[PDB]
Design a protein around this ligand. Structure first.
Ligand code: GTP
Ligand code: MG
Lengths: 68, 63, 66, 70, 63, 486, 68, 78, 66, 64
């Protein structure tokens, strides 16, 4: 039921942790086969806590390990 | 193996694996997440006009 | 399937897919003509299907009786 | 523009194009290109393997070993 | 063990057929069944093994 | 010479090695202790013959007459009936290929020797009950169901001689399903009438019911035959298919889905359409169309046979075709793995029902851990004779400890208690044998939870006895004598 | 194919040394191979000092090179 | 072949080393067709630290090397 | 496809550089379809020459075909 | 795809590929080892319900 939980999380803003170690929070619009989702309002800390803003970010599923 | 879920003919940046990045206009996607970039400016800005990026090193692209 | 060769002296000796040759030692048959032969030999054959008819009427019982 | 047509145009042009190793800036491939396979496997012809570059002839590179080629 | 073998007379009957000489079964408390159409639909091109093969031929009763 | 032997001179190939059996000797989690039991002439001995021919490569059944491996007495050969129960220790693979040690206690099916079966019910942990499909439930099957419930053992049922529904009775396959379901319902009704516990219910969906033909080498559960479809088509998951096969589930090929309601009239169930009807078509193609459509049918099943194998008679050729199709016997092994517990797991109700000191005594928990180290508690019930008939060998399982050859050891009889010490008598151990029916394997150390022949303890023992350490002994009680059914 | 069978015959008749991608060189009798290049070796000493192991199964993703 | 031997040796206590340097020694309870396995009574040694006892540990293909036990004949699975 | 390049590399010398900086040059014996190659009489460094060696499917960053 | 049955309701401790350790009660898992766990407390933070990919989970251990 994880795919239905991921499909039910659309339209909201959630945070996630990168596989390198970074953390980013944003709101997704579309999802891909390999979890290469497109999201906006990305508050990218750039793996050091320095907050930066991004929009319409399409990040592959290999970069982000799990939600946070 | 499919194309990305974002289709594109607009100025956007893309940080690759290892910390490298490009900034240019997208031309198209591939099944192995390979992208074609026109006027790719390096964000680390050298350009060669046309750039081909494989999806194995592709990490995160943002507008 | 037995109509051609039923009354020969050596029935299928000339054929090669049925007998081994003219020494006429081994034979391999097919099931429809085997069922035909089984139907044709109905008068000289038993009606029993198991040896339970020969309970005290078989060879070991007769050896014990002797 | 799909990357297959761009790869075919780069193979037909056979120009010196700088290609970086897969998240590895210590090795760069910039030189003449001889052929490309269906799974993006490349065979070169005396390309520059810049660290310092030293062309030798036939060099085989994997499809996922290329990070950015321009 | 008793050979309960039924001899058939007419060849018009099927080779596998409930004879009147056999006593009827007359079968008259729940089974651990899965949920109805919850999941597990069968994929394409799977089948019983001998679907195109008929159940019995004319030589089956003779054999 | 006294030729009561039927004894092999040398050991066979047996596929695996003896040191692998010695490595699997000591695990006590991959080992199952199984009594095969049922009515007279229900194919238990032929089932052990199929397991032996699967295991032993150079041992083959003759074409005309049935081999009988466990019937080693010449009285059983002349009479044609089982008389004395025989143990066989074998290594068997499951559907997943994991090897398991199996202690199979082939028992006579005549009710007058039914006490012999109870001796096996002292030693084993699980019961496999054989029922003929044509005969149905008989007197000794009901009596052994009652005795297996009252001895508190796991019960699984295989239905042998299903070919008698096909070749002998010529039933339609829906009526064959009705007969099999009637047999399963009668056995479940007998168990529910006898057992106060309702946790155990026999069903093919739960993996409790096998289907077999021991003269044609057919043995399958639903999981093994769904594994046969899984090897034919790798897309499916065979566990959900085995859950969806039996019990009035219908298949819609338009939706490709299994429903509890029949989609059309004259639509068979999933067990009839997927299992029984290809078996009917295989046996009909062999016995009726051996020269016309048999190689086409064998090519549809992926089975290739040589030219000399197609020249065989109908019964050995059908046995060869079913052996090539179903392969090795794996559904029965998976039944005994996932429905008969280990000696480590199932040791506690055995010591609860058997030991007079009970599990509350300290040696009760010493035996309840099934430890190969510590006290040496063994229980010998059955006794076998040699070829000359001079001396006897005791046979029994080891509940705790290890036995060594040459080790002095104490035997305690039935009249032994904590104040009467005249039943105690001390002997050495000559040799230790792993007992396959026609050859014995010399071993040195036998751990707990495993069956063993003891040589040299035959003097102070009458019927059964308990075997204990002579020095370092304690207040060791006696296992209960065998309460017989008759 | 046949080269892998010859390598398995050499590892049965002698000691084969395989250097994995995790900077470990294991010398021993390699018993079994796999389609995913997984190697099962018997009585293998792995140096990364050489530590001895009875039976070692390694996936082919972590392997790098092998020789007789 | 090697996966068949890993499924066949899924009873005795074995030691599995991950790619991250984590080594866990315990009794294998269930091993799937992939490299995912379940172990019990695992005396798992931490990465350059002390070991801890885990009741049930489940491991994708992150394990690099696995130390199979000595119960392996020449034709047990060959 | 590198199938013809693998077929033409039989009995010929080539060099391969690993991802860990190990370059080995020698006569190629056989190469699999997933670029799993085995060689013979190869000299390696990262080392020396040992004879016949094999490589993994993707253990080499670049292979310099001699 | 088989470890989700034994840990259907019990809480578990998960180790991600980034070195993070979390504790939470798993609810369901996908066929590609994408496991959904509620009340995933970061080790000190709280994240609640979160879904982890198959390649993300380096190792797992049973907590509850
Ligand atoms: N039709 C058919 N007959 C079988 C099958 N298996 C065994 N039989 C016959 O059943 C007879 C009796 O079975 P046995 O081999 O003596 O084994 P059993 O049932 O344990 O008999 P006891 O040892 O006396 O208890 C054998 O002689 C076989 O001819 C079978 O699968 N199909
Ligand atoms: Mg018998």
């Amino acid at each position: 039921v994880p795919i239905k939980v991921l499909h039910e999380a659309e339209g909201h803003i959630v945070t996630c942790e990168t596989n390198t170690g970074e953390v980013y929070r944003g709101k997704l619009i579309e999802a891909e086969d390999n979890m290469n989702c497109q999201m906006s309002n990305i508050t990218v800390t750039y793996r050091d806590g320095r907050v930066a803003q991004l929009e319409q970010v399409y990040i592959r599923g290999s970069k982000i390990r799990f939600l946070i | 193996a499919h194309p990305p879920e974002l289709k594109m003919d607009k100025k956007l940046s893309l940080k690759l694996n290892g910390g490298r990045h490009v900034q240019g206009i997208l031309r198209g996607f591939d099944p192995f997440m390979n992208l074609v970039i026109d006027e790719c400016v390096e964000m680390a800005q050298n350009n060669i006009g046309m750039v081909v990026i494989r999806g194995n090193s592709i990490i995160m692209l943002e507008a | 399937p037995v109509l051609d060769w039923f009354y020969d002296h050596q029935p299928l000796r000339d054929s090669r897919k049925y007998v081994n040759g003219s020494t006429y030692q081994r034979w391999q048959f097919t099931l429809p003509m085997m069922s035909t032969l089984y139907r044709l030999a109905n008068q000289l054959l038993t009606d029993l299907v198991d040896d339970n008819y020969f309970y005290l009427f078989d060879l070991k019982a007769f050896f014990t009786s002797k | 523009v799909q990357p297959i047509n761009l790869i075919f145009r780069y193979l037909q042009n056979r120009s010196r194009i700088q290609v970086w190793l897969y998240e590895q800036v210590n090795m760069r491939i910039e030189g003449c290109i001889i052929g490309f396979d269906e799974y993006m496997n490349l065979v070169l012809d005396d390309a520059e393997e810049i660290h310092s570059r030293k062309q030798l002839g036939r060099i085989m590179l994997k499809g996922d070993n290329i990070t950015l080629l321009q | 063990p008793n050979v309960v073998f039924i001899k058939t007379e007419d060849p018009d009957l099927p080779a596998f057929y409930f004879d009147p000489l056999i006593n009827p079964i007359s079968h008259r408390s729940q089974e651990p069944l899965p949920d109805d159409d919850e999941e597990f639909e069968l994929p394409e091109f799977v089948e019983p093994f001998l679907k195109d093969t008929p159940l019995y031929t004319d030589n089956t009763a003779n054999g | 010479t006294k030729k009561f032997t039927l004894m092999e001179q040398t050991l066979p190939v047996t596929v695996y090695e003896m040191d692998f059996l010695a490595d699997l000797m000591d695990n006590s989690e991959l080992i199952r202790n199984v009594t095969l039991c049922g009515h007279l002439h229900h194919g238990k001995t032929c089932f052990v013959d199929c397991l032996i021919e699967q295991t032993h490569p150079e041992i083959r059944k003759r074409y005309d007459q049935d081999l009988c491996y466990t019937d080693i007495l010449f009285t059983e050969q002349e009479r044609g009936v089982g008389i004395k129960s025989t143990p066989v220790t074998v290594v068997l693979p499951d559907t997943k290929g994991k090897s398991y040690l199996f202690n199979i206690m082939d028992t006579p099916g005549h009710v007058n020797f039914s006490d012999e079966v109870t001796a096996g019910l002292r030693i084993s942990d699980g019961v496999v009950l054989f029922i003929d499909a044509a005969e149905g439930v008989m007197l000794n099957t009901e009596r052994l169901i009652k005795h297996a419930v009252q001895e508190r053992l796991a019960v699984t049922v295989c239905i042998n001689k299903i070919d008698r529904l096909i070749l002998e009775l010529k039933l339609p396959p829906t009526d064959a399903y009705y007969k099999l379901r009637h047999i399963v319902d009668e056995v479940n009704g007998l168990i529910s009438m006898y057992s106060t516990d309702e946790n155990l219910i026999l069903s093919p969906l739960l993996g409790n019911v096998c289907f077999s033909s021991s003269q044609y080498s057919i043995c399958f559960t639903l999981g093994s035959f769904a594994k046969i479809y899984a090897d034919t088509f790798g897309d499916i998951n065979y566990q959900e298919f085995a859950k969806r096969l039996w019990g009035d589930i219908y298949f819609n090929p338009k939706t490709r889905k299994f429903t509890k309601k029949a989609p059309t009239s004259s639509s068979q169930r999933s067990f009839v359409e997927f299992i029984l009807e290809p078996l009917y078509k295989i046996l009909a193609q062999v016995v009726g169309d051996v020269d016309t459509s048999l190689p086409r049918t064998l090519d549809e099943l992926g089975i290739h046979l040589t030219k000399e194998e197609l020249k065989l008679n109908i019964r050995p050729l059908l046995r060869l075709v079913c052996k090539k199709f179903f392969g090795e016997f794996t559904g029965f092994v998976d039944m005994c793995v996932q429905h008969i517990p280990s000696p480590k797991v199932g040791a506690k109700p055995k010591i609860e029902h058997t030991y007079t000191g009970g599990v509350d005594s300290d040696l009760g928990e010493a035996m309840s851990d099934c430890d190969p180290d510590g006290p040496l508690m063994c229980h010998t019930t059955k006794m076998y004779s040699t070829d000359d008939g001079v001396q006897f060998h005791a046979f029994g399982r080891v509940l705790s400890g290890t036995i060594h050859a040459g080790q002095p050891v104490k035997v305690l009889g039935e009249n032994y208690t904590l104040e009467d010490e005249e039943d105690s008598q001390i002997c050495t151990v000559g040799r230790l044998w792993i007992s396959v029916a026609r050859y014995h394997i010399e071993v040195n150390r036998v751990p707990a939870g495993n069956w063993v022949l003891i040589e040299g303890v035959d003097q102070p023992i009458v019927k059964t006895a308990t075997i204990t350490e002579p020095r370092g002994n304690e207040e060791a009680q006696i296992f209960r004598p065998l309460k017989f059914n008759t | 194919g046949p080269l892998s069978v010859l390598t398995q015959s050499v590892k049965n008749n002698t000691q084969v040394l395989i250097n994995c991608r995790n900077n470990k060189k294991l010398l021993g009798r390699v018993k079994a191979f796999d389609r995913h290049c997984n190697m099962v070796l018997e009585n293998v000493k792995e140096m990364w000092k050489d530590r001895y192991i009875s039976k070692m199964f390694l996936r082919g993703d972590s392997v790098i090179v092998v020789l007789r | 072949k090697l996966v068949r031997f890993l499924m066949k040796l899924s009873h005795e206590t074995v030691t599995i080393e991950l790619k991250n340097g984590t080594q866990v020694h315990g009794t294998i309870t269930g091993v799937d067709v992939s490299m995912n396995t379940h172990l019990k009574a695992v005396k798992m040694t931490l990465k350059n630290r002390e070991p801890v006892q885990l009741e049930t540990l489940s491991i994708g293909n992150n394990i690099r090397y696995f130390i199979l036990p000595d119960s392996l004949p020449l034709d047990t699975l060959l | 496809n590198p199938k013809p390049f693998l077929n033409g590399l039989t009995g010929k010398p080539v060099m391969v550089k690993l991802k860990w900086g190990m370059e080995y040059k020698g006569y190629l014996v056989s190469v699999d379809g997933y670029m799993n190659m085995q060689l013979a009489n190869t000299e390696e460094y990262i080392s020396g020459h040992l004879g016949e060696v094999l490589i993994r499917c993707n253990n080499v960053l670049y292979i310099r075909g001699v | 795809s088989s470890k989700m049955l034994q840990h259907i309701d019990y809480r578990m401790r998960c180790i991600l590929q980034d070195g993070r350790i979390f504790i939470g009660t798993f609810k369901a898992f996908d066929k590609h080892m994408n496991l959904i766990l509620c009340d995933c407390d970061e080790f000190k933070r709280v994240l609640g319900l979160v879904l982890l990919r198959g390649e993300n989970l380096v190792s797992m251990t049973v907590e509850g």
